[PDB]
Design a protein around this ligand. Structure first.
Ligand SMILES: Cc1cc(/N=N/c2ccc(S(=O)(=O)Nc3ccccn3)cc2)c(N)c(C)c1O
Length: 126
């Protein structure tokens, strides 16, 4: 099986804006997670071909990753902070669906998610 195309990251038919929350999500949240020691599985779409995961895209229909999120932020793809937050949550959830408790990748997701949630608790005002 081929990989699916990656998620879209730019669309000139959507309106654009910068908000203080979206700024925080790129400059604080995304950049803090990106440099973490456990970021590496999450920095690009899951390459099911290269990683020998032939059922990955049979199970995961809404793939998401932080490379995609970073590009979406940088391209003003998101209008609402919640859309971005949702993408992070999808990314974690997919990892929990496909993998099992105690897998190394799950433990890495958990740690990154706890950090994510801490930072989201510190989002500034609308
Ligand atoms: C999200 C997710 C990601 C997964 N793998 N992601 C990977 C992402 C990148 C690599 S890498 O370029 O070899 N870089 C490495 C490999 C090992 C250690 C540090 N960096 C390997 C795997 C994976 N195998 C599953 C099952 C997942 O659910």
């Amino acid at each position: 099986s081929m990989n699916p195309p990656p998620p879209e990251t730019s669309n000139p038919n959507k309106p654009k804006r910068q908000t203080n929350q979206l700024q925080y999500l790129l400059r604080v949240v995304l950049k803090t997670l990106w440099k973490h020691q456990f970021a590496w599985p999450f920095q690009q779409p899951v390459d099911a071909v290269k990683l020998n995961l032939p059922d990955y895209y049979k199970i995961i229909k809404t793939p998401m990753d932080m490379g995609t999120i970073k590009k979406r932020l940088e391209n003003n793809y998101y209008w609402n902070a919640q859309e971005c937050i949702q993408d992070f949550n999808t990314m974690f959830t997919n990892c929990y669906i496909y993998n099992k408790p105690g897998d190394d990748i799950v433990l890495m997701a958990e740690a990154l998610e706890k950090l994510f949630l801490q930072k989201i608790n510190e989002l500034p005002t609308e």
